[PDB]
TrEMBL record:
Protein name from the UniProt record: Carboxylic ester hydrolase
Top-level EC class as recorded in UniProt: hydrolase
Protein source organism: Lucilia cuprina
Molecular function in Gene Ontology: carboxylic ester hydrolase activity
Tagged with keyword Nucleotide-binding: no
Gene field: LcaE7
Residues that bear N6-methyllysine: 7, 18, 38, 40, 71, 89, 196, 283, 303, 331, 357, 396, 492, 528, 534, 554
Post-translational modification N6,N6,N6-trimethyllysine, affected residues: 152-153, 534
Residues with N6,N6-dimethyllysine modification: 7, 13, 38, 40, 43, 71, 123, 152, 196, 262, 267, 283, 303, 324, 331, 357, 393, 395, 464, 482, 492, 534, 552, 554, 562
UniProt keyword annotations, A-Z: Disulfide bond, Glycoprotein, Hydrolase, Serine esterase
Length: 567
């Protein structure tokens, strides 16, 4: 929940940003070709007086409306003439993260393309960003994801949208209905196919595509690395604070359509056909507004995070993305064999600051920690002595003083949601790769002089520490950003972060002696034989270090000593 004070501050920023964006618009437009027809973009400036060509609102699928609601995306219809791509389209239907009202449109299957030069001297690395937001919020609007920092360099940057919430992730068991789930991930697949087939029209190299994303966008990038649907479509992946085997990254939601339908007024019985017929006629704002009530008492008890999201699909279809649990998909995944970079911030769990302020009794979960034991290890009642013993191990790892604290809780959150699933993924993947390198980073640069709207969500004004999503301020311009002095630590961090990402996108190796402060860095990928992970720690300096989280990671791993087949 955001304070009325911040809500007014945000409204002011929205208006000032609109007029800034007018002043950053030039009168120069340009036409580019696509496989479906011509698109008109516009040349824009940044506050640093770089410039780029901007194409927003390029459709990669038919609008998923009418009969196409809840279905896999369908290829767009070609057009004659020139499609205006000089303004953004709407975002997927969602609850606005500040206003608390439903916004967006079902007509949301668009991507945006940015480059400083449409006819470059050499074909360019293509970087594709998949936004996070727990599969329920997010957008490719430049008030949050401005390309202004990346286009300083000679890359093509593409920001996609995909369907969110129940409209993107409804799943029904009945094969006749053709709603198996994961429509939003199938949207990402269709966008990646568009990019492969069209990036050359914007100066991009279709043989050198990098997909990256943060939070649910990292889980998404990983899903795109796992599924056969995308085999060979891109060439590097970057997983920023998340992956597809994170506990929050998938769910079995096939029974929840009936519950959502009932909340929306459905009077019938629980059969998929009648439930789907009702949901097809519902207003989309109503469905998205009610999503927050869908989890049952039993599901909340079992700590299910979100009602709708990526799911293991119940039957096979032509467009099936997840035919098995992602842990199993790792065993055969094409993306295990492309260069990969993974990392997290240095205090991920600081994201839950405001939740702990609202429910301080949450700290009592640290008394035994049994509710943090991985579900595959815990008895159903979480009362078995062995479950209590694993809880005690988690408690030892994170409770540093006599009484558990909110900081202890947030430290635990960093591990359960980010560091431990990283570790489990690295170790699983080593069994199913042929030497392709994986590099680790740790983002450890703290500033409140350059922020992004996630800080308002966690009520993070004045809070020290590098929270989940704090690094996005150094990758993307946003409407809370300001021009920073060239000599400032924030400016240098923009240069370093975009620089490392572009270097990795280009070569599959994130090191470059051209990046300031990187000269003396020896950044080796993680080897199967490594017992302690090494990472590039990004603070005011760039330093290789043993991952500070390693000891706690090993303590979590120790829970599986007598259950190694589940690790």
């Amino acid at each position: 929940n955001v304070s009325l004070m911040e809500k007014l501050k945000w409204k002011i920023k929205c208006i000032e940003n609109k007029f800034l964006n007018y002043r950053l618009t030039t009168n120069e437009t340009v036409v580019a070709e696509t496989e479906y027809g011509k698109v008109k973009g516009v040349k824009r400036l940044t506050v640093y007086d770089d410039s780029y060509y901007s194409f927003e609102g390029i459709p990669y699928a038919q609008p998923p409306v009418g009969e196409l609601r809840f279905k896999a995306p369908q290829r767009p219809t070609p057009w004659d003439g020139v499609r205006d791509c000089c303004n953004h389209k709407d975002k997927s239907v969602q609850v606005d993260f500040i206003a608390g009202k439903v916004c967006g449109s079902e007509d949301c299957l668009y991507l945006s393309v940015y480059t400083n030069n449409l006819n470059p001297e050499t074909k360019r690395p293509v970087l594709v960003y998949i936004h996070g937001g727990d599969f329920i919020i997010g957008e490719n609007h430049r008030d949050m994801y401005g390309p202004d920092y990346f286009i300083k360099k000679d890359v093509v940057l593409i920001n996609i949208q995909y369907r969110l919430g129940a409209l993107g992730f409804l799943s029904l068991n009945s094969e006749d209905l053709n709603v198996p789930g994961n429509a939003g991930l199938k949207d990402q697949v269709m966008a990646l196919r568009w990019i492969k087939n069209n990036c050359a029209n914007f100066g991009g190299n279709p043989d050198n595509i990098t997909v990256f994303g943060e939070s649910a966008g990292a889980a998404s990038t990983h899903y795109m690395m796992l599924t056969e649907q995308t085999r060979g479509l891109f060439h590097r992946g970057i997983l920023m604070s998340g992956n597809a085997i994170c506990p929050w990254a998938n769910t079995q939601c096939q029974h929840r359509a009936f519950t959502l339908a009932k909340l929306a007024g459905y009077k019938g019985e629980d059969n998929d056909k009648d439930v789907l017929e009702f949901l097809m006629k519902a207003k989309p704002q109503d469905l998205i507004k009610l999503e927050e009530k869908v989890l049952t008492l039993e599901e909340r008890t079992n700590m299910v995070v979100f009602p709708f999201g990526p799911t293991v699909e119940p039957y096979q279809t032509a467009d099936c993305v997840l035919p098995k649990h992602p842990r199993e998909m790792v065993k055969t995944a094409w993306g295990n064999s492309i260069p990969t970079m993974m990392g997290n911030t240095s205090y991920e769990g600081l994201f839950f600051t405001s939740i702990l302020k609202q429910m301080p009794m949450l700290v009592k979960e640290l008394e035994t920690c049994v509710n943090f034991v991985p579900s595959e290890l815990a008895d159903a009642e979480r009362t078995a002595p062995e479950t209590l013993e694993m809880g005690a191990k988690i408690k030892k790892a994170h409770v540093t003083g006599e009484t558990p604290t909110a900081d202890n809780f947030m430290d635990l959150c960093s591990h359960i949601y980010f560091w431990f699933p990283m570790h489990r993924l690295l170790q699983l993947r080593f069994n199913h790769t042929s030497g392709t390198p994986v590099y680790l980073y740790r983002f450890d640069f703290d500033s409140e002089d350059l922020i992004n709207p996630y800080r308002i969500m966690r009520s993070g004004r004045g809070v020290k520490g590098v929270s989940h999503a704090d690094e996005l301020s150094y990758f993307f311009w946003n409407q809370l950003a300001k021009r920073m002095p060239k000599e400032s630590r924030e400016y240098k961090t923009i240069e370093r972060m975009t620089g490392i990402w572009i270097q990795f996108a280009t070569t599959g190796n994130p090191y470059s002696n051209e990046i300031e402060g990187m000269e003396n860095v020896s950044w080796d990928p993680i080897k199967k034989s490594d017992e302690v992970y090494k990472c590039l720690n990004i603070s005011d300096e760039l330093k290789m270090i043993d991952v500070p989280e390693m000891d706690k990671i090993k303590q979590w791993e120790s829970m599986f000593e007598k259950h190694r087949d589940l690790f």
